[PDB]
Design a binder for this molecule. Structure first.
Ligand SMILES: [Cl-]
Length: 310
């Protein structure tokens, strides 16, 4: 409503709480949150003055300091970095790809509604699960919602809400299967495996493949075929408060979050996050491509997997 009076800010903060359905513990938290809000406000304003290709805004995270945001919503990957795979049959190659100028699997009805992970380092399950929903639509024609909680609960190579691996989750689904979200809904806490209580799996895939890492072109090819699980560095302020446009940085290559790549255009790769529709462009972000950065911006080309289904 305006920055030129504390009075007007408090009002702004109030209507922002109402917009993001935000209820607090007590008024001691409310005042505290306002300070943080008001701090993030100055930063957003100072930054949307510069003329970048993207801008920030008072999204769902306007409430939180970067430190708190890091801890709660990042580090689904963090963990401790593999060393790249078993060293057997995965990587694909190249030769002569001819892909569309643009791709967006939403427009083929292959993508479910944006999910919210809450404060869990579970993004590795959502990233996986959404590329599974897609691949199945793409092959059988139906779009279904499958269970992130099941992976949370059941994947022994991963660490529940303290991070995990997308490739592991993909691979569980190829060897065992997965249940519908409604049979096994999301609680945002890890519990015991309840796969046996649920009867038959709803679906099973056939395998998983890694895409050649540090290779922009190999990832575009893959996206033109299906959504792909990818990882990136999402702990920065500019990322937290991202509202729209083509994200360009700054970010490092210390990946800590897993998301899904549902498309691309000439200058960007389109990415589905799991922080709900109150973040980004209704839950998505366009990340800049074509810079000849081997890593990709935010280390996007670091570690990419997708499910296989005949
Ligand atoms: Cl169900």
């Amino acid at each position: 409503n305006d920055l030129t009076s504390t009075e007007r800010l408090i009002q702004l903060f109030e209507s922002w709480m109402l917009k993001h359905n935000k209820i607090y513990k007590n008024i001691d938290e409310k005042i505290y949150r306002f300070e943080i809000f008001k701090d993030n406000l100055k930063y957003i304003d100072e930054t949307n003055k510069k003329n970048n290709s993207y801008w920030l805004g008072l999204n769902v995270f306007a409430d939180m300091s970067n430190d708190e945001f890091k801890e709660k919503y990042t580090g689904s990957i963090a963990g401790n970095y593999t060393t790249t795979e078993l060293s057997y049959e995965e990587v694909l190659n190249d030769g002569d790809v001819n892909i569309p100028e643009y791709v967006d699997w939403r427009q083929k009805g292959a993508v479910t509604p944006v999910k919210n992970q809450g404060s869990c380092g579970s993004a590795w399950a959502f990233s996986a699960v959404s590329t599974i929903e897609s691949i199945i639509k793409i092959r059988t024609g139906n779009l279904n919602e499958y269970s992130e909680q099941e992976l949370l609960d059941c994947d022994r190579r991963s660490y529940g809400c303290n991070g995990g691996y997308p490739w592991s989750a993909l691979q569980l689904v190829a060897q065992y299967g997965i249940h519908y979200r409604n049979t096994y809904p999301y609680e945002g806490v890890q519990r015991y495996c309840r796969s046996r209580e649920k009867g038959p799996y709803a679906a099973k895939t056939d395998g998983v493949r890694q895409v050649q890492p540090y290779n922009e072109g190999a990832l575009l090819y893959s996206i033109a075929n299906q959504p792909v699980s990818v990882v990136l560095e999402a702990a920065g302020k500019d990322f937290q408060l991202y509202r729209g446009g083509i994200f360009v940085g700054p970010c490092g290559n210390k990946v800590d979050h897993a998301v899904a790549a549902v498309g691309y255009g000439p200058n960007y790769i389109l990415i589905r996050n799991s922080w709900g529709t109150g973040w980004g462009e209704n839950g998505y972000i366009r990340i800049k491509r074509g810079t000849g950065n081997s890593y990709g911006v935010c280390g996007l080309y670091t570690s990419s997997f997708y499910p296989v289904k005949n």
